[PDB]
Ligand binder design. Structure first.
Ligand code: HEC
Length: 119
């Protein structure tokens, strides 16, 4: 539904904290390590990157929904603002988020870009 080409450019806003790197080490987008690798994130189980120290809130969503993977819809909501997304799922207004960056536009496009590299 989104446009991956605009998504790729907008992802510049994410790359301070996230890379897109394939399992063989191929860099699609070089980025930081503060947040998890986002290669393959679309259709991935929520908070499931081994070795990453996730916050308590996103782990609670995964524990409550053990089979739940990132849908495009959920990704669009989460990247808009992680906090209300966690609050809705956990029912805890104090739910912890390690990510507070907000993307108020072009969300579907960034998600389309990520989907192109979630083969
Ligand atoms: C650092 C300041 C960040 C920026 C800028 C962006 N994100 Fe992020 N992200 C960050 C952290 C520390 C975490 C872990 C969250 C937690 O509470 O543990 C995340 C997480 C995500 C996820 C979920 C990944 C998973 O494996 O489940 C996604 C899908 C995600 N981030 C996407 C994303 C995008 C698209 C960004 C730019 C618009 C972006 N993040 C910015 C840290 C940081």
């Amino acid at each position: 539904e989104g446009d991956a080409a605009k998504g790729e450019k907008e992802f510049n806003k994410c790359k301070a904290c996230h890379m897109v790197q394939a399992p063989d080490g191929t860099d699609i987008v070089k980025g930081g390590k503060t947040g998890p690798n986002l290669y393959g994130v679309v259709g991935r189980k929520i908070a499931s990157v081994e070795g990453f120290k996730y916050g308590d809130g996103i782990l609670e969503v995964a524990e409550k929904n053990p089979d739940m993977v990132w849908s495009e819809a959920d990704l669009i909501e989460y990247v808009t603002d992680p906090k209300p997304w966690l609050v809705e799922k956990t029912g805890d207004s104090a739910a912890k988020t390690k990510m507070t960056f907000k993307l108020g536009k072009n969300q579907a496009d960034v998600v389309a870009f990520l989907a192109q590299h979630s083969p």
